[PDB]
């Protein structure tokens, strides 16, 4: 819920991190929107 510089397993950006209703498949690590741009990520230690 705060604006932060993030690095998830090398996926580096700046944004506010929020809980999601998106369910990824077990092997998917980040999610992209219609313009091939990252809008969700899986946290590698606790997998939400």
């Amino acid at each position: 819920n705060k604006c932060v510089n993030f690095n998830f397993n090398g996926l580096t950006g700046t944004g506010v991190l929020t809980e999601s209703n998106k369910k990824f498949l077990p092997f998917q690590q980040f999610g992209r929107d219609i313009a091939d741009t990252t809008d969700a990520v899986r946290d590698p230690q606790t997998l939400e």
Binding site: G15, D33, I34, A35, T37, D39
Partner: peptide
């Protein structure tokens, strides 16, 4: 008529007249 990009610095501005003001005119 049927009608995201903000992380790329794109922004959409509202019109000066609302759709209620166009409906009034």
């Amino acid at each position: 008529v049927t009608l995201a990009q903000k992380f790329n610095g794109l922004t959409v501005l509202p019109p000066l007249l609302t759709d209620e003001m166009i409906a009034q005119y």
